[PDB]
């Protein structure tokens, strides 16, 4: 299997757990599934890779199923980037 080439959408509000982590529920829109979900957290400038992804190698099984991704953004402003290139879903997050 390879990285998903297509776009992603979010099925529910991003939920902050009691363990200082965030859970994202994603739906794949593109082709080539099953494929690996490209997901990373970037700084305020949308440059350097920050925080971490908790879930092991998240996969999009098809274009109907929902992929549950647990991640840990750093404190303050960050950007959760789901997918590849300019088609990628960018989600602004602020951790208190």
């Amino acid at each position: 299997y390879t990285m998903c080439s297509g776009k992603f959408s979010i099925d529910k509000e991003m939920a902050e757990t009691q363990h200082g982590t965030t859970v994202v529920k994603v739906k794949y829109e593109g082709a080539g599934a099953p494929c690996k979900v490209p997901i990373e957290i970037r700084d305020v400038n949308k440059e350097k890779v920050v925080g971490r992804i908790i879930s092991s190698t998240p996969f999009a099984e098809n274009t109907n199923s929902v992929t549950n991704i647990e991640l840990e953004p750093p404190f303050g402003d960050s950007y959760i980037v789901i997918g590849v290139g300019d088609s990628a879903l960018t989600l602004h997050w602020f951790r208190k």
């Epitope: 099925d11 529920k25 199923s65 929902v66 960018t90 989600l91 602004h92 997050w93």
Partner: single-chain antibody, 226 residues
Framework: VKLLEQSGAELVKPGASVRLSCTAS????????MSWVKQRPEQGLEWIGR????????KYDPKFQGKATITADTSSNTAYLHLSSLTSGDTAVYYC?????????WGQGTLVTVSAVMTQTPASLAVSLGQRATISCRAS??????????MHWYQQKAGQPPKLLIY???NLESGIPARFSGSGSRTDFTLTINPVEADDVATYFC?????????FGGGTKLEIKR
């Protein structure tokens, strides 16, 4: 495709109560938002409310509070709509739907017969074949969440459920021709159809979903210039 299976038509007397069902397949409802939408004959789409089946949290449009009760059973992967003290005003097609960034999935609709701000412009328009058509949506407040505009566009052809065209203001839904495009940020949004084709004759609706209520615009009927 058709992942949402709705219960059959209801024909009741006033004062009755009904419980409509929506069974999902190909996904677990726990991981989604399940909404119900009302449509009176020849009228616009009205968001009733939504359930988060994971915790049973429900939110309703102020108009439907006291009339509608949405429930969910994660074990049978079914969402329900309870309507109490039914009146002729409740006669409508009721749709169940899945999604937050627009409703990509709709049920077939359930007809319930009781035998007794989002500003969209224009109300209707006509354009010649091959020409550009533009439909506008103005929200009374900003519709951003996580730096993204939660503004969506739908097409609804006569006697059919609506279908998602554009989600998150400018993203083209899979299976939708590239002649459909969305633009805008802040409070003003536009759906562009260019070039217009004969098969584009339908009613178009905008919808916001950043915060509850997930209000639909009043709709715009598109016709071809005679």
């Amino acid at each position: 495709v058709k992942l949402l299976e709705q219960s059959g038509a209801e024909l009741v007397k006033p004062g009755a109560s009904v419980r409509l069902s929506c069974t999902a397949s190909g996904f677990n409802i726990k991981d989604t938002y399940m909404s119900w939408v009302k449509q009176r004959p020849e009228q616009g789409l009205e968001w009733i409310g939504r359930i988060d089946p994971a915790n049973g949290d429900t939110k309703y449009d102020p108009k439907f509070q006291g009339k509608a009760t949405i429930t969910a059973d994660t074990s049978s992967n079914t969402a329900y709509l309870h309507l109490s003290s039914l009146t002729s005003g409740d006669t409508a097609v009721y749709y169940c739907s899945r999604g937050w960034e627009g409703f990509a999935y709709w049920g077939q609709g359930t007809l319930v017969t009781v035998s007794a701000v989002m500003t969209q412009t224009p109300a209707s328009l006509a354009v010649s074949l091959g020409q550009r058509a533009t439909i506008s949506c103005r929200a009374s407040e900003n519709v951003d969440r996580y730096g993204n505009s939660f503004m969506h566009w739908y097409q609804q052809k006569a006697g059919q459920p609506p279908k998602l065209l554009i989600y998150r203001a400018s993203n083209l839904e899979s299976g939708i021709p590239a002649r459909f495009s969305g633009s805008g940020s802040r409070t003003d949004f536009t759906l562009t159809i260019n070039p217009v084709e004969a098969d584009d004759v339908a009613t178009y609706f905008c919808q916001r979903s950043n915060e509850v209520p997930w209000t639909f615009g009043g709709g715009t009927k598109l016709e071809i210039k005679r």
